[PDB]
Amino acid sequence: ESQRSNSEEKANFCSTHNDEVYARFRLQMRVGVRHSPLYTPSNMCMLDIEDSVEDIEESTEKEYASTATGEAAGVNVSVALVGEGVSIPFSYIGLGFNPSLEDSYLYVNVSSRAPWVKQTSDLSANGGWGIKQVLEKELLAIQIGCDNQKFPEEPTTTPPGASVDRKRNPADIDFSLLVDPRCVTSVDLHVELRDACIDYKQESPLSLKGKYGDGELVKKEIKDVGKNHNMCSLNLNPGN
Amino acid sequence: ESQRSNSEEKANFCSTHNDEVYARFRLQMRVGVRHSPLYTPSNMCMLDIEDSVEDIEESTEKEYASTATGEAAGVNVSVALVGEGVSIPFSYIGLGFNPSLEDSYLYVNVSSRAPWVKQTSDLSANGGWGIKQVLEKELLAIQIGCDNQKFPEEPTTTPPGASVDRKRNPADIDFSLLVDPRCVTSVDLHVELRDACIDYKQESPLSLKGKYGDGELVKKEIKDVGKNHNMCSLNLNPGN
Ligand SMILES: *[C@@H]1O[C@H](CO)[C@@H](O[C@@H]2O[C@H](CO)[C@@H](O)[C@H](O)[C@H]2NC(C)=O)[C@H](O)[C@H]1NC(C)=O
Ligand SMILES: *[C@@H]1O[C@H](CO)[C@@H](O[C@@H]2O[C@H](CO)[C@@H](O)[C@H](O)[C@H]2NC(C)=O)[C@H](O)[C@H]1NC(C)=O
């Protein structure tokens, strides 16, 4: 009759905070990778998470961006979640990659902070102003580059106003996906941004989803790549 | 009467491989950190693990080096384990760091592959040639730099033959520790290199230990920094 499975810490938090609304963002992505002839195998991994605040000329509101970057296997990824008046910061990025020459899949997780671990912004404030800002304005921007790879160039130049129950039917998240086709052969993507306690609520206006290629596949394959890939991850101090 | 506590996977492996000798290296290190006035807070983490093989002019033997590097909080660390004729590759490096301006501790784990996860070199080969090579020749080299920080410069130039039971009494590991005192205010270090199954053996010639500052402290504090520090780690694919 009810299908949820959560930690005690999650259930206790949600039972106790039913009038609040916290957003939770989760991304899983599979990137098909290929290398230039010059690429040498490397276990190197670079991870970063940065939050930025930009004044909006039009408004009293700020633009809040959380940007997760990861670089491994000759490919660099950028995931940016951007809101107006609403900040949803990332707390985790994890990469799964094969260090070799061959074509392979690079796996990316990005997540925002679980409200039970540390409390995020309460979007119920001001009559649910934050919720509306997310539904109307939130942007996701994904970029996948191929640095610092050098590819073969032929010799010449010299480089020697209605509210909706979206728990049932999620709205589409607004996202762009920019890739460099020299090193990126495919992308599968599943992304969701929703009330972190949506499991303990009958209905909710705050549920957004994005998909590219076989989202369901990556959502599952990504839990099973530790056996055959390098894994690296950055987890932000709970508290900052 | 017997005080060991290990996973079933470890106990089953060691019971089954009592005639083999596998080495296991583990390092825990605490680095006192300080920043230049220009340093801006950063969650960035860079990790790498590289294995190298250098021909020795004198010998038929090769020099095998495993090098773990990590960079975070304005400090870059290098841990290199070097053997002659013996390769003991790293499979894991983990960093715990505070991204802020303030002085803080950076925590480093480096470990080599657990033989139960994947089999490493059997040092029992050739009459225990490998064991002797480790006891006699193994080198550990630790370097801690402060890049890419720029520090205040006064304006002028412009930058605008006996076998021993060492299970009881470990031999000293031969190590160097090079630090840049501009960004490094202290070092506490515990390091051990020993028969990975030494728990299941009455005696063993293969046990080496290194200590600097309060080794015992760091060995313990490092298990409890997740609560108040960024954590990042690189774990190599079991299999390569
Ligand atoms: C991405 O995140 C998922 C968790 O959502 C990770 O899943 C764990 O994966 C390990 C081994 O890969 C399993 O043993 C665990 O059971 C998984 N946990 C859960 C909750 O299912 C996955 O590892 C991550 N992938 C990357 C590349 O970081
Ligand atoms: C270094 O390695 C140790 C394991 O030897 C890590 O210890 C775990 O730490 C977490 C939280 O920090 C604890 O909840 C676990 O119980 C610890 N495991 C064990 C086996 O004790 C420690 O996290 C690592 N430190 C860094 C900076 O990577």
Ligand SMILES: *[C@@H]1O[C@H](CO)[C@@H](O)[C@H](O)[C@H]1NC(C)=O
């Ligand atoms: C990838 O790296 C290159 C070179 O550093 C950089 O110019 C490019 O903007 C990066 N792209 C992404 C997606 O971060």
Ligand SMILES: *[C@@H]1O[C@H](CO)[C@@H](O)[C@H](O)[C@H]1NC(C)=O
């Ligand atoms: C730290 O970084 C600097 C600049 O990249 C480099 O010159 C130095 O050798 C590095 N030191 C270590 C310990 O890796």
